[PDB]
């Protein structure tokens, strides 16, 4: 069979298939080992076996084909690719390769690619001449992504508040700032649903760093897209490698005239992982953070842009404030003006149980004239004028009150205008 | 005879039994040595011996059946299991194995397992088909573990405050943050009694790390369950290995659709022990800690989850703050967002002898709507709105005063809803 559907099957069916297929015991070891054993047993028969995965290039030169189901985790069933194939077809880390794999011979442990018949969802002879990501000319965002749903529910209400506070376009560097227990996970979930329903063409890749396992499973079940996460019990190098693989896959996809949206769970956690994994350079700032250590997360965050040739990369990351650890504060301070927009969540609104707890006065994008029309954006300015001279919690309560009895954004605008 | 009942008799009775059996000089030797001598004498008598214990696999390949009465301490009375037996039944560390044992022969110094007839309180055939713990999908806790006894005693007051402050469900990852001499040991004792009374079906395990011997004896006498401890006069390797044994036994129990609960006296002490044991990786964070050193305690804490297939693993661990040590501070900093519920004990409330010294405004759980009913959630919300403005010590004094005048929490809510 094909490795993808074999891996996607739950464990019970895998065990039953292995036990009625010839193997003797599968219940008491990991899913990756069961997959490897089933593949090895089916491979000795001689039937061709297919497989696909994202390419990760090691420092030696050989590469591996990790899978999204296992969250890009190194395992016994990873496909091995020699540098000969990398020379034959120009391949970099993050490329998606699909083809047929060969059984592992003596002296080798992992499977190997027989021949590749898909690179980045098209022919390799057509994909090895594509211009690279950094050579593309960045531009300001000009195509707005609408989170308006129209169903009229509460998630629609918070999506409408999101649209009012800061419009979202393709290729921006959006940043969310939020205290703990302020509702940022639900905000990200609602953004994911809005993106999935409104713009099915865009590629959505939710990335969670240093997350709890239950949150990972809930996000995987809720989101109609690629979700990759690394729980907190895993080492920092695991977080770093997951982030690198995600960003490389996003760059490879955007080089093919595709729109990619990345919903990073915590830029703070990624920065902490990078600081942990980056060797000490002898320079220690406040909170024990090195500038060269912060270079990598800044490089990850700055890849968001709009491509003149085609496609875009919209990175929306979240940051943690007033947690109590100085490292988060210094990360926020060195991440103040990096993004072209910001949205602030208020703890005071959260404890009042008024959701979403968006601080309208402090949140807001810039250069939004390129995103929306003229009259709607003028309505946005006059709403800003109305909201400005009054308290943020009262402003948020007023916004929920005036968005609840109406139905969509333009209806609220015309009701408020008169 | 049976070994696990021989290990539970007092030392004086053991000495009398060995003396009337025909043994000498048993008074001035350790309890394990007396047990081994009595076992050898009764074995050379000719009769059969039954023994049980939790399996621990050594790096060489063979394993030992440790006993929880000695808190899994290596001793002469441990049962040796050969790699052949670990191979015929695929066994992992933490498996509870019960069966007949045989006397040692020449060249070997341990009793050996003869014929295993119980694995994890099940026949050996069925225990081979249990799915590994890592393959199960974690979920949010949705089955409430009610703490209130309802007998009207003052010891129940703490439990009642718990039910108002931070509800606990099956599969929680609770964290208790308390200063020294704030009442965390009595809080854990109250939780253990409430669990043993309200939910007899759950498996209760109390794990004490770096403890004092008198506290160990007190907890063993009080707690109706399994108590294993490693006192402060033992090497860090002992703390580490006791923690691994407990967590592996818990995972093996959970794999059999059992819901188990672990009460960790100090995650800080466990992190200390792991930092001592784990070799350095060249990078040392503030206070003298290593990231890979802290990786294992994070795995221990993150093992807690609610299993979709059935069963759960609740872990409630206490963390130390304001102890004057930077290592504890950094450990708590790295353990902040991991748990899904936190309970804060305040030193100031303890100074004025107000118990339980719970910081109500800081304590709480995540996704508490799953644990409680709708009306109960509304009552908790209005209570939190009432208590929020006032200071922590005033809040707890007022809450205790209000709670002392009722019998159950329903009556308290009805009195508040006047
Ligand atoms: N849009 C919303 N509508 C209703 N409740 C919300 C909303 N956003 C957050 N909450 C509340 O916040 C809690 C979860 O917060 P969460 O999203 O986990 O914040 P964080 O991810 O920052 O910890 C839930 O109990 C929920 O009641
Ligand atoms: N619920 C309670 N009721 C009465 N006294 C308490 C309570 N909890 C703690 N105390 C007092 O606090 C003292 C120390 O508490 P302890 O159990 O030693 O906590 P810790 O282990 O944090 O030091 C005890 O002597 C006890 O008198
Ligand atoms: Mg969250
Ligand atoms: Mg104590």
Collect contacts of B65-69 with beta carbons under 8 A, ≥24 apart.
B65/B97, B65/B113, B66/B245, B67/B4, B67/B7, B68/B226, B68/B228, B69/B4, B69/B7, B69/B8
Nearest residue, CB atoms, A28 vs list B90, B292, B364: B90
Nearest residue, CB atoms, B338 vs list A217, A232, A236: A232
Residue from A200, A226, A97 nearest A145 by CA = A200
Q: Coil, helix or strand for A39?
A: helix
Using CA atoms, how far apart are residues B208 and A327, in angstroms rounded to an integer? 31
Distances, alpha carbon B219 to alpha carbons A43, B63, B207, B228, in Å: 56, 29, 10, 9
Using CA atoms, how far apart are residues A409 and A144, in angstroms rounded to an integer? 15
Handedness of CA A277, A279, A280, A285 (dihedral sign): negative
Where along chain B do its domains lie?
1-126, 129-417
Scan for tokens 């009374």, then name that residue: B197
Residue from A177, A189, A174 nearest A141 by CA = A174
- Tell me which ligand sits closest to the C-alpha of residue A182: 1
How many contacts, defined by CB atoms under 8 Å, are there between A and B?
Answer: 77
A305, containing H or E segment: strand A305-307
Ligand 2 contact via B186 beta carbon (within 6 Å): yes
Is the Cβ–Cβ distance between A162 and A176 less than 8 Å?
A: no
Using CA atoms, how far apart are residues B118 and B125, in angstroms rounded to an integer? 9
Q: Among B158, B159, B186, say which to mutate for ligand 2: greatest number of ligand atoms within 8 Å of CB.
A: B186
Nearest chain A residue to B286 by CA: give it.
A288
Residue from B167, B183, B194, B201 nearest B373 by CA = B167
A41, containing H or E segment: helix A31-43
Residue ranges in A76-173 assigned as alpha helix (H) = 83-88, 124-127, 154-165
Show residues of chain A in contact with B135, CB under 8 Å.
11, 30-31
Question: What spacing in Å lies between the alpha carbon of A403 and ligand 3's midpoint?
Answer: 26
Is the Cβ–Cβ distance between A159 and A284 less than 8 Å?
A: no
Using CA atoms, how far apart are residues A275 and B145, in angstroms rounded to an integer? 40
Residue from B54, B38, B53 nearest B1 by CA = B38
PDB resolution in Å: 2.6
The 3-state secondary structure of chain B reads CEHHHHCCCCHHHHHHHHHHHCCCCCCCCCHHHHHHHHHHHHHHHCCCEEEEEEEEECCCCCEEEECHHHCCCCCCCCEEECHHHHHHCCCCCCCEEEEEEECCCCCCCCEEEEEEEEECCCCHHHHCCCCCHHHCCEECCCCECCCCCCCCCCHHHHHHHHHHHCCCECCCCEEEEECCCCCHHHHHHHHHHHHHHHCCCCEEEEEEEEECHHHHHHHHHHCCCEEEEEECCCCHHHHHHHHHHHHHHHHHHHCCCCEEEEEECCHHHHHHHHHHHCCCCCCCECCCECHHHHHHHHHHHHCCEEECCCCEEEEEEEEECCCCCHHHHHHHHHCCCCCCEEEEECHHHHHCCCCCCEEEEEEEECCCCCCCCHHHHHHHHHHHHHHCCCCHHHHHHHHHHHHHCCCCHHHHHHHHCC
* Interchain pair B299, A231: CB under 8 A: no
Ligand 1 contact via A185 beta carbon (within 6 Å): yes
Beta bridge mates, B66: B54
Residue from B174, B192, B145, B194 nearest B366 by CA = B174
CATH dotted code for A129-417? 3.40.50.300
Q: Coil, helix or strand for A314?
A: strand
Chain-centroid distance, C-alpha B287: 27
Nearest-CA residue for ligand 1 atom 14 is A183
Method of determination used here: cryo-EM
Scan for tokens 């404890």, then name that residue: A351
Tell me, what DSSP letter sits at residue A204? E
Nearest chain B residue to A348 by CA: give it.
B388
Beta bridge mates, A119: A97, A122
Tell me, what DSSP letter sits at residue A66? E
Is the Cβ–Cβ distance between A119 and A91 less than 8 Å?
A: yes
Residue from B178, B186, B235 nearest B209 by CA = B235
Pairing of strands B174-178, B111-119: unpaired
Fold of A1-126: OB fold (Dihydrolipoamide Acetyltransferase, E2P) (2.40.50)
């Amino acid at each position: 069979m094909n490795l993808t559907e074999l891996k996607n099957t739950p464990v019970s069916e895998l065990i039953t298939l292995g036990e009625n297929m010839g193997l003797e015991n599968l219940a008491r070891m990991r899913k990756q080992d069961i997959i490897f054993a089933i593949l090895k047993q089916h491979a000795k028969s001689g039937e061709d076996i297919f497989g696909d995965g994202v390419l990760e290039i090691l420092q030696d030169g050989f590469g591996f084909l990790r899978s999204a189901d296992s969250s890009y985790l190194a395992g016994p069933d990873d496909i091995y690719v020699s540098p000969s194939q990398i020379r034959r077809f120009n391949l970099r880390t993050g490329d998606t390769i699909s083809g047929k794999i060969r059984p592992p011979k003596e002296g080798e442990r992992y499977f190997a690619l027989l021949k590749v018949n898909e690179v980045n969802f098209d022919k390799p002879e057509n994909a090895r001449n594509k211009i690279l990501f950094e050579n593309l000319t960045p531009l300001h965002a000009n195509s707005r992504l609408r989170m308006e749903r129209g169903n009229g529910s509460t998630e629609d209400l918070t999506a409408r508040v999101l649209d009012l506070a800061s419009p979202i376009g393709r290729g921006q560097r959006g940043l969310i700032v939020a205290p703990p227990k302020a509702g940022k996970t639900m905000l990200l979930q609602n953004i994911a649903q809005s993106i999935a329903y409104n713009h099915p063409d865009c590629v959505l890749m939710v990335l969670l760093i240093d997350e709890r396992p239950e949150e990972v499973t809930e996000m995987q079940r809720l989101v109609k897209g690629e979700v990759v996460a690394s729980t907190f019990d895993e080492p920092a190098s695991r977080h770093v490698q997951v982030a690198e693989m995600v960003i490389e896959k996003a760059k490879r996809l955007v080089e093919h005239k595709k729109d990619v949206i990345i919903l990073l769970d915590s830029i703070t956690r990624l920065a902490r992982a990078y600081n942990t994994v980056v060797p000490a350079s002898g320079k220690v700032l406040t909170g024990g953070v090195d500038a060269n250590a912060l270079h990598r997360p800044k490089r990850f965050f700055g890849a968001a842009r709009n491509v003149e040739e085609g496609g875009s990369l919209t990175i929306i990351a979240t940051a943690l404030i007033d947690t109590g650890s100085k490292m988060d504060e210094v990360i926020y301070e060195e991440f103040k003006g990096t993004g072209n927009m910001e949205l602030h969540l208020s703890r005071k609104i959260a404890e009042k149980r008024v959701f979403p707890a968006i601080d309208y006065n402090r949140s807001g994008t810039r250069k939004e004239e390129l995103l929306t029309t003229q009259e709607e954006l003028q309505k946005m300015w006059i709403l800003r004028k109305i909201i400005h001279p009054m308290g943020e919690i009262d402003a948020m309560e007023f916004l929920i009150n005036k968005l609840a009895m109406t139905k969509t954004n333009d209806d609220f605008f015309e009701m408020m205008k008169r």
